[PDB]
Write a protein that binds this ligand. Sequence first.
Ligand SMILES: CC(C)C1=CC2=CC[C@@H]3[C@](C)(CCC[C@@]3(C)C(=O)N[C@@H](Cc3c[nH]c4ccccc34)C(=O)O)[C@H]2CC1
Length: 455
Amino acid sequence: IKEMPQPKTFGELKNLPLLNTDKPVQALMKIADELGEIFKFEAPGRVTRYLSSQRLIKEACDESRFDKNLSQALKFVRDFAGDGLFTSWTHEKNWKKAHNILLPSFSQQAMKGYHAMMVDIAVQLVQKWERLNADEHIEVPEDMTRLTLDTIGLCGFNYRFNSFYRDQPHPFITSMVRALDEAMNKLQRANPDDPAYDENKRQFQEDIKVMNDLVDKIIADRKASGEQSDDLLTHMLNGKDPETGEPLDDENIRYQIITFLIAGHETTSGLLSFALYFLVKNPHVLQKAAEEAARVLVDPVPSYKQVKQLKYVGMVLNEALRLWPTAPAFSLYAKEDTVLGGEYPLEKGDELMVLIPQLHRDKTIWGDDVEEFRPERFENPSAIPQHAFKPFGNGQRACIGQQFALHEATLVLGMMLKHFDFEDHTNYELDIKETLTLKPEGFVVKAKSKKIPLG
Ligand SMILES: CC(C)C1=CC2=CC[C@@H]3[C@](C)(CCC[C@@]3(C)C(=O)N[C@@H](Cc3c[nH]c4ccccc34)C(=O)O)[C@H]2CC1
């Protein structure tokens, strides 16, 4: 057996102070560089092991040996996402029921139906950019977040956040962003029962209240209406689990819509923000992506068929997902006593953190140029070893939204490369802000129209 490495210690507090930082994933990536494919992490009441190699993670991805664990991050989000699919244990009845009912709604076939609604928000973004005055710049994450939140709103619940009509975000979103921020702040908050956080707790309960009232209202209205809008809310009110014959209740539907609205905010827009960033830093890659867009997107508004044809744009999103996965870690627990890589023995209940950005830089898999933006790496999926590329997590607890997120990102990116030339006018220096997700903070561009009509 190997004694696995541990990073620097702080007497009683062990390693806890290393997560007392505004960029913990990046801090943890630098520790991985030093310590390698596994290190232990202790804190007063807990212990976790961080994996970085395809070698160890491919075993952790064995669902017969490891199941999804709720991280302290997920337990904190659970306070408003409840037993939604994202913050439920594999063994909760509402996980499997909601999973069986919703999978058909998130299928690559179901994308045919969402396409029109997605095109409606993508067109809103293109027109915003066509209507900019000369020398006016684009705030990339902010406009990408407008598109992604509006798209999950419209396609899911037939609800228009109308993000391209406002400076200040919708009220639901104000409360959701503040709630997610409270949840992320609680991780490194020592003495959280101190009365200084009474305004945090009071505000937290209000933000929860806002989210529940607005979503429960959406759900009440829809049932009272009787309208059969082809969308997630409809599928969830009419759906029945093949296994147990039961439908989701109204409270659990709410949790799913809250989970979807979290997922489709900065988590999804992150992918577009990192993609456009990599594209403008790598002009020969942008040029090739734009040539595909122009060749494939011959109609004034793209069809579902043409999006499937944007293969190089698909490879660009995968390569952005390799370097900066916007849900950068997920937690597993050993279902039984077991041995990882023949070296490190684990007792039943032991937790693993998978460090996805570090997996994606494993040079044994990707070779020596792992820091380079080469979409060509993804030309053949059969040449890529098992469990090498995990931006969407693993097995039955993988991202149900993967097809939706990739379809919207392919459509939108395609339309952006067809309609505009891009300028990195500030020569932007990457600064990755860490919240519940990752985003290139302050990332700005200019977009010259090619003056191609949408009509
Ligand atoms: C909501 C979803 C998308 C998220 C999942 C996450 C999982 C791992 C997280 C995360 C990336 C945020 C930063 C801490 C980190 C890396 C983590 O190890 N956290 C461990 C260990 C830990 C850190 N601080 C703690 C305080 C108490 C207990 C455990 C911890 C944990 O959350 O459990 C975080 C992002 C948000």
